[PDB]
């Protein structure tokens, strides 16, 4: 495998990388994103958003930074844990958490937390350069349907989805001041403009669920969340573009996690040659058990032959990862072809998934 980002040699010197993101586009492009963890692999750090890439399918990386923080704490100061999306006109958009102090960005606060913002910058040409960063949060004249009660919230970390029409949908994780608590839940928000304006959907209806993915299936939005300290990721529907959710039963529970906290993962959609179409899930199998994360595997499920069950395709990282943070991963696919990028042990690799899938479209 690859190595995209290497911590023992790279342009910026950073000591760790952390939380991958890949964009397959339409021409045959490759754009790839990475935390920038400079002091080391702790999330409340130092930390920038990098971009890698590639117009040779992966043999060659031109690399960049996207986003920076809001340069206020030399020690604390961080955009991070990427969430990203191609609209229909091609435009790249990236979604990231922005913060400049201690502590867990859902859980240090009990109102909403001061230094949190969400940050997003677009790219109309091909992720060559990136507009101004445009802050989301700090009015209210971007993201309508916003909960009071907010602690704080961003992405869903990975990829969002384009609906039918053009809606851009993309997964999200809330943070809300519940009875004297602090309840995190995950939810999608929406732009019917290209991303200049959001509408915030509501809540999934089981707490202590966080970073997801969303598809669609026939108008429906199915989502496949990191359930904490459940030993699964869970999976519910929605009908009415992230207003009410239901369990969906054909993949709750389905991918196991094993034991401690959950870990993020990655959940697209594809439709094969005859038609069908599956999903494809990427995330450690954690076997050893909490933070370890061993063997990141890529399932596969088919929504139009839900009797067959969940299908381990392969296991692209099978090793432990590192404690210190690692696990999470990206898949992506278009025109056929299937690309992935996970954490290993500090770095960022990157693989090329395509002879996976062409097992799976029995051509």
Known sequence: PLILFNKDNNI?????????NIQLLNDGTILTFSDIRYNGPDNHAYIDIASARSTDFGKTWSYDIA????????????????????????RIILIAGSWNTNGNWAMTTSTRRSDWSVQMIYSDDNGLTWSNKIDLTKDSSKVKNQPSNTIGWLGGVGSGIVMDDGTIVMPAQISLRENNENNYYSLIIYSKDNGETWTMGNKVPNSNTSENMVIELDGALIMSTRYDYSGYRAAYISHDLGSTWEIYEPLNGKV???????????????????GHRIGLISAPKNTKGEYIRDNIAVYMIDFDDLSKRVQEICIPYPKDGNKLGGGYSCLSFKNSHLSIVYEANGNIEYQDLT??????NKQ
């Open 12 to 20: 910026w010197n950073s000591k760790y990388f952390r939380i991958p």
């Open 355 to 360: 002879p996976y899938y062409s097992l799976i």
């Open 256 to 274: 196991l996690t094993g034991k401690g906290s959950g870990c993020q993962g990655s959940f697209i959609k594809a439709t094969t040659s005859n």
């Open 67 to 90: 986003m920076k923080n809001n340069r206020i704490d030399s020690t604390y100061s961080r955009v991070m844990d990427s969430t990203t999306v191609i609209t229909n006109t091609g």
